[PDB]
Design a binder for these strands. Structure first.
Ligand SMILES: [Zn+2]
Length: 93
DNA sequence: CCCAGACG
DNA sequence: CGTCTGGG
């Protein structure tokens, strides 16, 4: 049972990192685990976003397999090479 | 004022 | 789904 993760340039300035609970700026690289919001299970499965760094603090709780690296962050390939590199560094080996 | 579309 | 607001 793999977690389903995603990467992308934030679509707007109105989402909030789940790790630090700070607002993510439009345009910034952001990672998501799609899952159920505790306080809103009514919604069911939804995107929960993270600053890449904050995402990594919680790599384990989130269900990230360092064995598969970045391939499991659906949409990685769409990112600029610059960004694809920076990201790949932080991800645990 | 409006409302698509982002978010939770 | 209801809410909010960026960009008309
Ligand atoms: Zn954060």
């Amino acid at each position: 049972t793999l977690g389903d993760f995603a990467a992308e340039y934030a679509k707007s300035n109105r989402s909030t990192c789940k790790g630090c609970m700070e607002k993510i700026e439009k345009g910034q690289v952001r990672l998501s685990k799609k899952m159920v919001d505790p306080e809103k299970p009514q919604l069911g499965m939804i995107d929960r976003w993270y600053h890449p760094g904050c995402f990594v603090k919680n790599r384990e709780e989130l269900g990230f397999r360092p064995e598969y690296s970045a391939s499991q962050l659906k949409g990685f390939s769409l990112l600029a090479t610059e960004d694809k590199e920076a990201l790949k560094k932080q991800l645990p080996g």
